[PDB]
Amino acid sequence: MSEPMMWLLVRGVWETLAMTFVSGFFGFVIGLPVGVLLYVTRPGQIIANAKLYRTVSAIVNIFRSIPFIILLVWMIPFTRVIVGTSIGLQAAIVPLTVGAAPFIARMVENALLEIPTGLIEASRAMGATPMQIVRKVLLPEALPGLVNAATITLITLVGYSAMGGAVGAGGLGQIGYQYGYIGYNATVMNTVLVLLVILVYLIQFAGDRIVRAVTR
Amino acid sequence: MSEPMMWLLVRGVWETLAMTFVSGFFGFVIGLPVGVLLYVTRPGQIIANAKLYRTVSAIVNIFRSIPFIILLVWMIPFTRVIVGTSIGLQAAIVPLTVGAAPFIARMVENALLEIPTGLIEASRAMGATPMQIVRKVLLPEALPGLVNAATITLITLVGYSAMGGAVGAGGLGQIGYQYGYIGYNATVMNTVLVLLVILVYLIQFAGDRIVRAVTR
Amino acid sequence: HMIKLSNITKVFHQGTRTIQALNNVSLHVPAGQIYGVIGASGAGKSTLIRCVNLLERPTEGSVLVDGQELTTLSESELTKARRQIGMIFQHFNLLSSRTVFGNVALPLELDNTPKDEVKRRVTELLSLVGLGDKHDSYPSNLSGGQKQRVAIARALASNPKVLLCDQATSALDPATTRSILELLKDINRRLGLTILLITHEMDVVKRICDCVAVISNGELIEQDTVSEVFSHPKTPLAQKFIQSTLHLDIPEDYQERLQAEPFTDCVPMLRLEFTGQSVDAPLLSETARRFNVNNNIISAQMDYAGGVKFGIMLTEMHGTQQDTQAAIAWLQEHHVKVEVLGYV
Amino acid sequence: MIKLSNITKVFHQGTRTIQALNNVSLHVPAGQIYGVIGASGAGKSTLIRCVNLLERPTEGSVLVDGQELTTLSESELTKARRQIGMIFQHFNLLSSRTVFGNVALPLELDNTPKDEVKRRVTELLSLVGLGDKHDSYPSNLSGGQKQRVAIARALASNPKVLLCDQATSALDPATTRSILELLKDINRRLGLTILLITHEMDVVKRICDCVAVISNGELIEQDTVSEVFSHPKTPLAQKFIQSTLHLDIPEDYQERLQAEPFTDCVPMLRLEFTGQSVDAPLLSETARRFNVNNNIISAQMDYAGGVKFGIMLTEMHGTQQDTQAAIAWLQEHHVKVEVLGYV
Ligand SMILES: Nc1ncnc2c1ncn2[C@@H]1O[C@H](COP(=O)(O)OP(=O)(O)O)[C@@H](O)[C@H]1O
Ligand SMILES: Nc1ncnc2c1ncn2[C@@H]1O[C@H](COP(=O)(O)OP(=O)(O)O)[C@@H](O)[C@H]1O
């Protein structure tokens, strides 16, 4: 391997952790409240909206049903308008989080749905307010669930950020696209593979370590 | 709105379909046998090698870890040595099949762990062969989950299929890439997006509904 | 009257069809007393209890606790109201995430309280329920009863005037339901805490309840005191529940033979109610000697409900057409209720 | 049909040795319904498995229809398992099959002509009262209805033995009545040896000819039902008979109850009746004869296998000379009289 390459990988390893973790964060700042407000609106729950649910549920399904690459490309104009660029590390983050929100919100609600409804009932009975019941009761109870989703989201975002390197998000994905496809060096491809696999096992192992840490 | 253009784009719709299902098909051919192998080999189950399950579940896992483009790209030499080509669908369904298989088997295994043990027990007491259990009992009982597995397999594959455009697998995703990432014709990018969204729903409404029919 | 439910009627539309959950149910729980509502599954127990709390909205009626009206009220008022009513549930409803300690404290956090009282209030309420050992444990670790103690201490956190019970002992074993009910019982006596109660188990009623309503299909069929319901039951159903608590089994072979049409060589099979006066009175032993009857006892139980003895017997009476007629009549004079279930 | 000899099984789990069953030996006379009762973890589930070898005893001998099952070709053990039908708590049917097909499965396993399985299945279905229900799925069926499918399927093989694992354990008492009644009418009509385990002494009564009682992986009593319900040898058996007969000494009494005679006391008694004793006007006789007053705190009477039995808790008011005289009279008449204490 060329020394200018080793140093280039280390950008990507970074530009990968960057995209993946940042996209993740923003995706939760959105999907999380989306998820919560998808849980409540179902029949029987604290605020039950037949119609509000249907709307939010169809659109997440729409957004979720657009294969990420197609999301990214269709989003080129959006990105520039907001970022001022369609290119690079921070440009990637716009589509990359739009691609994460539907995964996340759906998961969050599915995690909330694991919580036995009698817990709500206890809570209202103590004179607890719908905000109180969320942050005081519901979220704490799915923390394992939610931390599980995070693990599963960040991993998803790696593959997403990698496919962003065909469209120039940079990162280890860019490096693979160039040196495994455009023109080929065996060594460079092979350490791209191996870097990515490790980033995932590490992301997986760590999450499990956190989820296993929550009390039974 | 070119009649010249539309027909290529409509050649593309065929390009995904062929790519999605042929992979889906071969994926299962590998995925389904491997899946029962995992299940039955688990500690409580029929064959029960915890040493064989450790091995196979590892192969299964490391392959699931590799993000798809990185697998698609890394695979080219092999894809080639197989098909003789690289660009084009008949070559694409190689890495698209390997993309699915391991992903599948874990679904199979998970779909088999869904059916109550002790149908096995009832079953054993009747003189049931291990073969007979799988064939006569296990599989038929798991079926609504096997079909749900494929709906997810298939829908997953559409998006996988589209990542292939960047690497020139030549499908609706390639039309979005070429015209979306470079040309930015706005009517084709809107059309490619809606076409595919439409394709996910049809895959799921088909399976979502065919599951309804297979249950009890 | 601590809590007052007046003409409470609740209807639901689930389906095409419309079910009536509760119809003109009215009951007053005098303060410092333990009130049971018993009935079959689907009678409206769960609804009825919930209305008091306005976890359910009574379609029409009045809900009055501590004199304070509830039905029409501001949601910010309903919170401070709910500080006065503790509640416990059949499925214990603890946060799996929190320690037994903090589980109790959560209602104390709902309105902001200094961390200092919380440490105080909680330690107390835990020494009360007998969990003081266990401050640091997680509910997944607890056995069934321990959970209900927690749930009780938790409902008692706000130091409420009224405790509600939703099938609260229903998932515990016979051994524990005794120890839970007697713990609740103390709190009622010691702190004078008012208790509303719902059960399908008459046993729960005769153990700790002062008053009892029998509910059937949204309706209250019998409203009296426990002493009065277990002694001189005014309803067939009422009898069914009572007859149950004392486990009284008339073997299949008897019901098969028993026929309301009298035959030759037949003796009457009759069931006998004893109230506190007649319970210790040797009315059967006497009745043999006097009326030269043979008393054949098919099964029988005596118990206590609300500080009052009572009991029931299925027997067949062997004697002369006159002798039998005579001794029956002597039991009626002595405050045995004699009811003839057939001939055999 | 079933002769199990000195059978012991130890599980290999958790760096811990458990005795599921320890030196267990059981003969079941062909043609008979034979119960096994015990507590959770008492080792019965382990045991009933040992018959058709759903569990392998670490030592001991199983033989059915004279044939020792312990050393067997896995291919011979299928053929062996044709003569032992089984049924389960949770009914264990294929949700994917209809009532009809579910019954036809074991016939399918060892290959049978299309019409022969039609003949067989259709017959066993009327037998179980499901001939109405041929096309239904287990979705649409009652726990009893399912357990009838389960039965029909057990008999497809036309076996010499029918194993019941907690078969009624979850069912309507009403329906528990109907299924045991059906198991019975099969015993009587078809000469089907039946072995069942339960924690429920009430089923033990209903259809069992003999009953074993099991603890710590050993079964301490083996007798008739008649014997055990009427003349329970072990306190544990008695306790079980305190489940069937419901005998409640009210709580006010224990604090009230005195260990030894105190001035102005009357004794409290446990009177146990057997057979003819039970239809006797024995207590009404003591009223007149010994001028005593019997007050009944609790009394239950029950049938078990063609013998009545009963127990009652009573006070006896009278003289020291009158009381000592009824009690004796009672004993001479074979009421067992036990003096519990004083009130
Ligand atoms: N939230 C609800 N939605 C629809 N129907 C209900 C609801 N709650 C109760 N019902 C119906 O009304 C009846 C009320 O009984 P419930 O409140 O469950 O008390 P119980 O303990 O007597 O069953 C139930 O049997 C049920 O059929
Ligand atoms: N396959 C098994 N592996 C390990 N331990 C078992 C197994 N089956 C049963 N046991 C344990 O050994 C004991 C055997 O008793 P069991 O046959 O279950 O009687 P019961 O039907 O009364 O539960 C049980 O207490 C159980 O916990």
Short mmCIF file of N, CA and C and ligand atoms in Angstrom, two decimals, chain C residues 10 12-15 19-22 38-50 56 166-167 198-200 215 217-218, ligand 1:
data_model
loop_
_atom_site.label_atom_id
_atom_site.label_comp_id
_atom_site.label_asym_id
_atom_site.label_seq_id
_atom_site.Cartn_x
_atom_site.Cartn_y
_atom_site.Cartn_z
N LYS C 10 -72.73 3.80 31.72
CA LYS C 10 -71.71 3.88 30.68
C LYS C 10 -72.00 2.96 29.54
N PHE C 12 -70.78 1.81 25.43
CA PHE C 12 -69.67 1.70 24.51
C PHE C 12 -70.22 1.44 23.13
N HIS C 13 -69.57 1.98 22.11
CA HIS C 13 -69.76 1.44 20.77
C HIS C 13 -68.43 0.85 20.28
N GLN C 14 -68.31 -0.47 20.34
CA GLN C 14 -67.18 -1.19 19.77
C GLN C 14 -67.31 -1.51 18.28
N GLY C 15 -68.41 -2.17 17.94
CA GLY C 15 -68.65 -2.79 16.64
C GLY C 15 -69.64 -2.08 15.73
N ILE C 19 -72.89 -2.18 23.16
CA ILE C 19 -73.02 -2.84 24.45
C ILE C 19 -73.23 -1.81 25.56
N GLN C 20 -74.10 -2.12 26.52
CA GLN C 20 -74.27 -1.26 27.70
C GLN C 20 -73.47 -1.78 28.88
N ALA C 21 -72.44 -1.03 29.26
CA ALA C 21 -71.52 -1.50 30.27
C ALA C 21 -72.13 -1.39 31.66
N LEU C 22 -72.77 -0.26 31.93
CA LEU C 22 -73.29 0.01 33.26
C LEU C 22 -74.61 0.74 33.13
N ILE C 38 -68.64 -7.26 43.62
CA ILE C 38 -68.45 -8.59 43.01
C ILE C 38 -69.33 -8.86 41.77
N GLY C 39 -68.81 -9.64 40.82
CA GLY C 39 -69.68 -10.14 39.78
C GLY C 39 -68.96 -10.98 38.75
N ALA C 40 -69.74 -11.57 37.84
CA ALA C 40 -69.20 -12.41 36.78
C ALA C 40 -68.32 -11.57 35.89
N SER C 41 -67.48 -12.23 35.10
CA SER C 41 -66.60 -11.49 34.22
C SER C 41 -67.44 -10.92 33.08
N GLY C 42 -67.38 -9.61 32.91
CA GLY C 42 -68.22 -8.94 31.94
C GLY C 42 -69.44 -8.23 32.52
N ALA C 43 -69.45 -8.06 33.84
CA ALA C 43 -70.59 -7.40 34.50
C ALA C 43 -70.45 -5.88 34.50
N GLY C 44 -69.25 -5.40 34.20
CA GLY C 44 -68.93 -3.98 34.34
C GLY C 44 -68.12 -3.58 35.57
N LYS C 45 -67.47 -4.55 36.22
CA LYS C 45 -66.61 -4.25 37.38
C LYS C 45 -65.52 -3.26 36.97
N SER C 46 -64.84 -3.60 35.89
CA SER C 46 -63.61 -2.93 35.52
C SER C 46 -63.95 -1.52 35.11
N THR C 47 -65.02 -1.37 34.33
CA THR C 47 -65.61 -0.07 34.02
C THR C 47 -66.00 0.72 35.27
N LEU C 48 -66.83 0.10 36.10
CA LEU C 48 -67.33 0.73 37.31
C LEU C 48 -66.25 1.35 38.17
N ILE C 49 -65.23 0.56 38.49
CA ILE C 49 -64.12 1.06 39.28
C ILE C 49 -63.45 2.24 38.59
N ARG C 50 -63.27 2.12 37.28
CA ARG C 50 -62.52 3.10 36.52
C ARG C 50 -63.15 4.49 36.51
N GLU C 56 -62.30 6.13 33.01
CA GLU C 56 -63.41 6.05 32.07
C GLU C 56 -64.38 7.22 32.26
N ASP C 166 -58.50 -3.00 41.55
CA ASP C 166 -58.95 -3.62 40.34
C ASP C 166 -58.44 -5.04 40.37
N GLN C 167 -59.31 -5.98 40.73
CA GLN C 167 -58.97 -7.40 40.81
C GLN C 167 -57.62 -7.63 41.47
N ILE C 198 -62.99 -4.27 43.55
CA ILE C 198 -63.65 -5.19 42.63
C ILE C 198 -63.02 -6.59 42.57
N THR C 199 -63.88 -7.60 42.61
CA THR C 199 -63.40 -8.94 42.55
C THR C 199 -64.42 -9.83 41.77
N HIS C 200 -63.96 -10.97 41.27
CA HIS C 200 -64.87 -12.05 40.89
C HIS C 200 -64.91 -13.08 42.01
N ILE C 215 -72.93 -7.04 41.51
CA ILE C 215 -73.26 -6.49 40.19
C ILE C 215 -73.47 -7.58 39.13
N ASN C 217 -74.43 -7.72 34.92
CA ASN C 217 -74.75 -7.11 33.63
C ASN C 217 -75.05 -5.62 33.75
N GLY C 218 -74.11 -4.88 34.33
CA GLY C 218 -74.20 -3.43 34.39
C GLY C 218 -75.12 -3.00 35.49
N1 LIG E 1 -63.01 -0.34 26.19
C1 LIG E 1 -64.03 -1.15 25.79
N2 LIG E 1 -64.40 -1.26 24.49
C2 LIG E 1 -65.41 -2.06 24.08
N3 LIG E 1 -66.15 -2.83 24.90
C3 LIG E 1 -65.89 -2.83 26.24
C4 LIG E 1 -64.80 -1.98 26.77
N4 LIG E 1 -64.77 -2.17 28.11
C5 LIG E 1 -65.75 -3.07 28.41
N5 LIG E 1 -66.41 -3.45 27.30
C6 LIG E 1 -67.54 -4.42 27.28
O1 LIG E 1 -68.42 -4.13 28.38
C7 LIG E 1 -68.24 -5.07 29.45
C8 LIG E 1 -67.82 -4.32 30.73
O2 LIG E 1 -67.12 -5.18 31.65
P1 LIG E 1 -65.69 -4.84 32.34
O3 LIG E 1 -65.53 -3.34 32.41
O4 LIG E 1 -64.63 -5.65 31.63
O5 LIG E 1 -65.92 -5.41 33.84
P2 LIG E 1 -65.89 -6.98 34.22
O6 LIG E 1 -64.72 -7.10 35.17
O7 LIG E 1 -67.23 -7.25 34.85
O8 LIG E 1 -65.69 -7.73 32.93
C9 LIG E 1 -67.20 -6.09 28.98
O9 LIG E 1 -67.68 -7.42 29.16
C10 LIG E 1 -66.98 -5.81 27.50
O10 LIG E 1 -67.66 -6.76 26.68
#
